[PDB]
Amino acid sequence: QVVKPTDERIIDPSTANTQLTGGVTYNTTSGGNKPLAGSPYGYETWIDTGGGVCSLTWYGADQGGGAAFKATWTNPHDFLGRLGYFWNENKPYSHYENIYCGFNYTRSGRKTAGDYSYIGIYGWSRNPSASNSNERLIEYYIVEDWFGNQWQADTSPMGINTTGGTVMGSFTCDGSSYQIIKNTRVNQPSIEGDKTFVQYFSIRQSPRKSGTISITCHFKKWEKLGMKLGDNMYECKFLIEAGAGEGFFDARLIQFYRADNEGNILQITPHH
């Protein structure tokens, strides 16, 4: 019932395999979202100074769909590099309509990012009117891929022994089943200081390094499983998270776009 966007500005992720160059490399924590010149996007880096060298490099507004980045980590303590929509303007997910991210990247192989790692979509949302105070703040992940670890292949999807929490259900978006997990974080760091909050994970059962993520598919079907996001979406960004290890992530494409149900573009980046 939701029409797949056909717009010619959409880059086909499957053939988006040209290495990109240039842009500014950041080696330090950004301290929240930092807006990028000539772009609707913001980036964030979390680079704990008690660990080794990390970086994030934005490839700019004019190539690789406009949100494309490279990241590196060398024995980090939970590196997070992310880039995408920053919102935080008191709107629920439904306000943004059908959200999509076309992606294609290379990364280092199995066991190059520690015991835990995440690649995919990430953000937060606020639900202050929830009667359960634990559910008033939500940290969320749509996990397309990871690096596996010493025990588990990177071709095998992670489970609750990595994430923690409880399996809520499963659903299908973009040609794979996703196992859905809810986890409670008790007095943990958050965008709101040290507190109790919930986490939502969609774990792609069949990991991939390219394709399109129908982000709204997740938001909607989380809601069907009783996992509500509230009325103040914080952000929706493409993430690489590395618990430890020595590795890299290098996007040839990260392209966000939004469309109504007819499939017509509401937002996209970027004569013969």
Single out the catalytic residue among 139, 192, 223, 246: 139
| Pair 27, 54: CB distance under 8 Å | yes
Domains identified in the chain, total number: 1
2 Cβ neighbours under 8 A, 6+ residues apart: 98, 216, 261, 263
| Pair 183, 158: CB distance under 8 Å | no
120 Cβ neighbours under 8 A, 6+ residues apart: 141, 142, 143, 144, 145, 204, 213, 238, 239
Tokens of 249: 């992530």
Dihedral sign, Cα of residue 242, residue 175, residue 61, residue 3: negative
Interatomic CA distance for residues 146 and 203, integer angstroms: 10
DSSP for the chain, please give it: -PPPP--TTS--GGG--PPP--S-EE-S--SS-EE-TTSSEEEEEE--TTS--EEEEE--SSSGGG--EEEEEES-SSEEEEEEEE--SS--GGGG-EEEEEEEEEE--TTSS-S-EEEEEEEEEE-TT-SSGGGSEEEEEEEEE----SSS-TTS---HHHH-SEEEEEEEETTEEEEEEEEEEEEE--BTBSEEEEEEEEEESS--SEEEEEHHHHHHHHHHTT----SEE-EEEEEEEESSSEEEEEEEEEEEEEE-TT--EEEE----
Query: Omega of the bond prior to 40 within 30 degrees of 0, cis?
Result: no
| Pair 127, 137: CB distance under 8 Å | yes
Interatomic CA distance for residues 90 and 168, integer angstroms: 27
34-35/69-74 β-pairing: unpaired
Residue 187, phi-psi category: left (phi > 0), alpha (psi -120 to 50), beta (remainder): left
Q: Which of 40, 85, 86 is nearest to 61 (CA)?
A: 40
Task: List phi, psi (to 5°) of 89.
Answer: -125, 30
Radius of gyration of the chain (CA): 17
131 Cβ neighbours under 8 A, 6+ residues apart: none
Domain holding 105, by residue range, is 1-272
Angle at 124 between CA 160 and CA 256, to 5 degrees: 100
Interatomic CA distance for residues 231 and 189, integer angstroms: 21
Task: List phi, psi (to 5°) of 221.
Answer: -75, -25
196 Cβ neighbours under 8 A, 6+ residues apart: 133, 134, 184, 185, 186, 187, 188
* Buried-exposed string 164-192: b where 16+ CB fall within 10 A, e elsewhere: eeeeeeebebbebebbbbbbebeeeeebe
Interatomic CA distance for residues 137 and 190, integer angstroms: 9
Interatomic CA distance for residues 79 and 71, integer angstroms: 10
Active site annotation includes 241: yes
Single out the catalytic residue among 44, 135, 235, 241: 241
